[PDB]
């Protein structure tokens, strides 16, 4: 049940072309689309497209997103990928491998809520 505005704004054919291109150009990184989960009470970020080292951990990526949204340490933040919260010890490369879509992007939503999308 994931809903990303990115997929409305950019058509699959062009997303896939970009994902192919960036995968080939940066073999040790993966392309990731990040958005706030629908209806969540967290700030939107200006940047939605992230080129992430494959060995960066999910936990390290959380730290970046938390910083960019200016969350206080005590504030909760959850990522959702295919409606599931990923483990912090996984690398972003592993998360990508198992979850990227057919356009070669991984889609990550962030939220203050522990359940996605409402």
């Amino acid at each position: 049940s994931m809903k990303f505005q990115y997929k409305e704004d950019h058509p699959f054919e062009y997303r896939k072309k970009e994902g192919e291109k960036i995968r080939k150009k940066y073999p040790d990184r993966v392309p990731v689309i990040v958005e706030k989960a629908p209806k969540a009470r967290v700030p939107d970020l200006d940047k939605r497209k992230y080129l992430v080292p494959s060995d960066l951990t999910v936990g390290q990526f959380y730290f970046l997103i938390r910083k960019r949204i200016h969350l206080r340490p005590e504030d909760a933040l959850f990522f959702f990928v295919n409606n599931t919260i990923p483990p912090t010890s996984a690398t972003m490369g592993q998360l990508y491998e198992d979850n990227h879509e057919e356009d070669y992007f991984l889609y990550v939503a962030y939220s203050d809520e522990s359940v996605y999308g409402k």
């Binding site: 940047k47 939605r48 497209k49 992230y50 080129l51 080292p53 060995d55 960066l56 970046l64």
Partner: peptide, 10 residues
């Protein structure tokens, strides 16, 4: 529009 990727640092 078509933004550039953020190049996330290790």
């Amino acid at each position: 529009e078509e933004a550039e990727f953020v190049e996330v640092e290790p």
